[model samples]
Target: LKAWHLPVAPFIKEQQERLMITLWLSGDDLPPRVTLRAEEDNEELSLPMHRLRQAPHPGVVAWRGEINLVNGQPRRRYSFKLLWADRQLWFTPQEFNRFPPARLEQFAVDLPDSGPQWVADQVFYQIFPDRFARSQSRTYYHHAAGHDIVRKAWDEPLTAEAGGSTFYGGDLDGISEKLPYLKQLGVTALYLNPVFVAPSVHKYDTEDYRRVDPQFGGDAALLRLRHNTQKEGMRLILDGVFNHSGDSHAWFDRHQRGSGGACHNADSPWRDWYNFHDWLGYASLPKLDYRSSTLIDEIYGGEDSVVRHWLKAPWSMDGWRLDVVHMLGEGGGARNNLRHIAGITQAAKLERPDAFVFGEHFGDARQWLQADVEDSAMNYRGFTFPLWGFLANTDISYDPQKIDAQTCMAWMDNYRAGLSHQQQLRMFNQLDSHNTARFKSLLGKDVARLPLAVVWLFSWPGVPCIYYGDEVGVDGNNDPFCRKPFPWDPALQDGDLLDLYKRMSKLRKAHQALRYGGCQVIYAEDNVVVFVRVYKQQRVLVAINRGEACEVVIEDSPLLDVNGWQLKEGAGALHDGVLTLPAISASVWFSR
Candidate 1:
């Protein structure tokens, strides 16, 4: 029942402990004994749902209920959304028909400790570990594409297309060495691609679950990196590849010749962990069978499980960027896929509570960002796509749909409506990532539009993550090009653009409103947009002109605060609220 109360933590947790839930059900079929079983608490409602009205359709009834956080129950961190059906058995919402998901999914709960200021305040630095840096050497290597890899030197020209054979010896030690550089650039958090012991460059095809690869200086280097990140006050997020594992993985390797597993002799410990025939049609990377208890336990049920490992002890990862969460348990039809996802997320957060377990969902993320399933997904459908369409005049090479400035704003408004303010603030926002073409490359290497694009990213809600060299204007294309080696020499990097990013980071960290506030598009014309970020005491105005030189005059509005108003960035200045903007530039003002 999607109603006013059905919004799973629909807004920020201003209330300490309160649960307000709503549902749409048949007027007569609505059960008297309706209860919910989340992670730990078994909520038994006695006063039942007060009838609101008839739903949009016939036989559909709207009902609502509220509860105070009293009694002996004090579970602040809640998981596993409850959608009751058949009067007794509780199931995932996907089970109940007429479940139309929204911006974030429908969950009837208060949500978790993921709603924090630090996540919103700090912009992220995304690194593809294999391409970012390489400290030293490695002996064992195989891409499983049947080709041997030839490691490259630091300054060598990159040969690219795409493959498992493109291994460069980047490791954790290299990242540790550059902690000062990241800190200098005002990177509050560092996100690395999958680091679990793997055979390939991308490390997506993970070989071992527990140990960090020897090539990455083993687990010792990871501990050192974690210590450095902690010392530098930087949050660390590691990539989690739980959907599938490499063919050489122990569970899957049991099928090779003199082996004994479900695929072979049907007498093995980890038999039901994976499917016998194929997985999402990829035989190399076999998918897990979530129906298996052992597999489920391995994923989240046990302490030594993959999700709990890095989040706790020696690694102590701040969170995880779940790869392919959109296709987690049932990319190829398992069972209770949604429940498994909710359970996996719950298990991780239960260990730390503040763990930022976001996912890499490409398209619509409404289903995944439910109350209990995931904290937030990558901000693609909301920020990245629309911004590209609006700024680039077309979503050329970016999105299939052609969009105008008006259409873009509508998308923003609608997307904003779907997400809770907290989710919007904590969402992973990026101009470029490992999966797509670089931002500069998307703009055809147009240096002028770079700052304008970043201004939008940093100003808008969500945690902005700068894709490796995107901050320094390192250009590349899709796949192999997008995953190019980072530029080590300053001679090859963009000094102005790097500083632009640093300034934005500094501003984001310093201002409370800009990082965590309501984003209102007060003005938007062709190649021009203005928004105001307001906290309790202060207000900041960000006006950007992506097209031509123009002066936007204003008075008796939020931007009219001319006292202690200093020109912040790019080519613009404000005098008595008369602001002049350079073509393809941004102007920011802070009211002290």
Candidate 2:
């Protein structure tokens, strides 16, 4: 799912950039003409499509040309089109979006500061509210209210059937209670997964878009959680599933068959809001139809929209983690495709220009991360899968044997190539989220390999995220199992893993090179990978040994000069580049 063949690169600020694109022109002498048009500005450049008969395939002659974009602000948008031989009969990305294989994505040349730059250097700790922690501060709201919400104790393991249905009632106040522990672990941001009102334990199904679920300690709990984050100078980002709503959401029910809601009632105004046969035919969770103007006016660019409401007042949430963003408008008509995503961002930015809104795009997401959409993605395909593939075989490994120590570098390179460098810095790079199995579970809980993974995560070119119980070695295949309650007892935690997490996190935060430097591979062989980061006068090198440990003899590689560099962490010096690596070790060095 990688845009492996797409020719995209990092945004070089203040510099003119050129992009090359090729179109298949394999017909009867059809070398008429082609032109590139800038979407943001009315700048057009024309070029002739050449016939390359001796191309890759026999009948594959193509048209290729370069288009230049000058450096400026607010970004410049563009799309290329083919013509009728000699005439100016042009095509556009708006026309059916694409002509089969005709690449008409309407890509853009851009900047990355669409949101807060403060999040660039921050480390995020993801919290799944329902199963994270339970507060001793007593609930003000009645737990056994109108709905039959089943509650579980702190130590109960969830039954597989009702994983999302089994209520292990951990709330925002519970998360606030663990703030000190998070602070000690060096967490700078909190990514809480859907604390809003919903039927299930996960809260993905939206019953109410605006109110925090009573199970999650409601509005006051969120405010209290925000208070802790604010006091600690940390940002709190809430998950927003704008794509769909629960089966019995009143908004949808008001139109359904019995309720005379939009679905069954001809006179109901909310009819178009709930797509009758959308969202993969999932009856319980209906998708929102983007074609409805009323939906857009109220949900997206509306004055007091759902996105903007919580971003204001005492519940001033700093950002959003848009759920299933790839499927937001994927139903029939496919209407207002890009417009819906852009509109939410437009509305969010208007409320507060610095609000961060990232999407949950699992695979090739370059389409949604353009000039005016989501800031970045979860980066499952881009960074995690690639790196994890080379390191270990996991449930989500996209390319298990597709990478080696050398190919590992290309993984990050190709990923960052399509993204703006600023976006690259802020991209969320993690081994596992609520959607995937725990990293520890995948790595077979190998203690030594844990640090190797951790070191790579922090040293890489993106903001590193640690899932709630990951620091203390929680294990689960995915979702409900992965969302286990935090171990309150210090004795249950793996001390070495906790220590390694604290040390590396602090090291990452303390060193500017780790966060802002340009990275280069110093040495690599088999399962061992070593890379260096250099920014200004500071340089930091990280060497990870994922394979069997040894004082492994190394072939000559001049990237390191042992005498000139000082060993900052881990065992052994470069010793004049005659490297001696330990089994499953991560050596960190900084040039003095």
Candidate 3:
């Protein structure tokens, strides 16, 4: 039997303090009785599920029940119990097993709202400011506010040991100049890497929270980009690097450039603002101490705090992408981490009710993605790593590891099962980010397989973000290499690959099913995987084959009803519930 339940509309709903959960069971000999077991504030209660109407499929049945939200808490976890003739089984969000699922494994229900509504409707584009674009007229500063910086040509190869001193002068004005190109490329939002007053190319370090880097055209350039982007109907997301500040910051002042600092003055007023120890032993970066109420107020709590300042009138950024979110806290080991993260989230919402608050977490982010915490996270565990293993036969570290189609899907399911439907859609999905090897490099620079990743990126549940230069087939491996400059030259860009991205972007934007539909795995083999996304009458089928040409038969599959299916890309045909596949390619079909 195939049984599943989602924490979203049609499957779940909240009415006052009461909530309903729906379970769908499909197969012959269905369980005679189904009960909903839910937890509220650690108290357990069971409610019998009433049988509803038959599902779209013949053998499928729907069961639903209501649970009272005890204590009026916003978060709740629930699972289902099925009673058979002689035995009983449990259905948790992760999987169906004999034992009851753990508290975290149960389905999450975030009352009132789960996340901002605008997140699912956006197509984000991530930009590493230093390499994305640079205006010719902008002044290149070799000495940025007494901090030494090395200026490089736009096309120069990045140095592995630059230590954040290298710069290409990619300023905010350069980004503003390309707003039309981004709008044409179907980009609805932009997530720029740290843009505050930092003496680094990546700008993660911060000397001043309220000031923009003067080399990058300072605060004036940001306002120009903001105005231009808003006029072009695009949203801006600034990178928040509040976990640590630059060692050269006025508070730390390792260089003794300031009159009073923690480094030189024993009883400096700002001494409590820092934890004193280096973040992960990086002497150049000093971790913030959340134990200091003064520091917390300056970072996010106060009205004019860095978190709220950018979201106000003139700067008015749409959201924040928190840097090293999980490693920030008092002392070390991220003590009272959730409390601080929630504080940031609360501050953002207070400034802008629909502000999208997400985190940069490379591992599992289930605990941080709850109702009032982060709205979503960079989905490295659920989407990026598994996709890398399946397609490139390597891990994020470029280690020799591979997973078959079935295993890859199962791996993704495990991580996604932890999130509510709202958080799942809000997730930041990308094929390659600034942290890892470029997708093309991961695939051994094979342009043919690039389309496979492009198709899958758009078809996935989360909003798709294109790392700058990936659309034009940029190839590199790891850190400095992955952060390659955008190839503005026509001769260096891949026209076909760029066209493929534009088409996929348009397809994703036009399809409601691709954005909000529920996912179903139709078939999975050694190297081929097929899945269908369905929302009401609209259906989108995505199929991929990494091996040689092979035909697969899917009995009682959704393909049977997609008679006039419209082809989006690659070469594939469906007839009488049998799918024809092309060698080492991917395909997408839309039901008309």
Each prediction's whole-model lDDT (CA): 0.68, 0.68, 0.82
User: Estimated TM-score per prediction?
Assistant: 0.79, 0.78, 0.93
Sort by TM-score, best first: 3, 1, 2
Worst 10 residues of 1 by lDDT: 3-12
Candidate 3's residue-wise lDDT over 276-386, tens digit each?
476788777888888999889998999998899999989999999999999888874499899999999899999999999899988878888754578889888888888
Between prediction 2 and prediction 3, which has the larger TM-score?
Answer: 3
Pick by lDDT: 1 or 3, better one: 3
Over the stretch 1-592, how does candidate 1's per-residue lDDT look in tens digits?
A: 3211222322223356656544444434445444332222544334344656545345555445555555423232221222345434232222242333331332332344345446887779998887787764333445356555667765666666335556667788888888888888888899988887777777777778888878678888899999989998889999988878867676766336336544465776767776653445766677777777778788889877889988898778888888877666743363576787787788888788788888887687866664448888888888888876766543525554555555677687666555665677788888778888776877763457878888778888788989988877788777777877788789989898889888988788778877766565666666677777755446678887867799876534422333567567776876766778888888787875
Considering summed lDDT, which 10 consecutive residues are worst modelled in model 3? 139-148
| All candidates: CA RMSD (Å) | 9.8, 9.9, 2.8
Query: Comparing 1 and 3 by TM-score, which wins?
Result: 3
Check candidate 3 and list the clashing pairs.
Answer: none
Clashes of each: 3, 10, 0
TM-score for model 1? 0.79
Candidate 2 Cα deviation (angstroms), residue 24: 36
Cα lDDT, model 2, residue 390: 71
Question: Which predicted model would earn the best lDDT?
Answer: 3
Which candidate number would show the highest TM-score if scored against the true structure?
A: 3
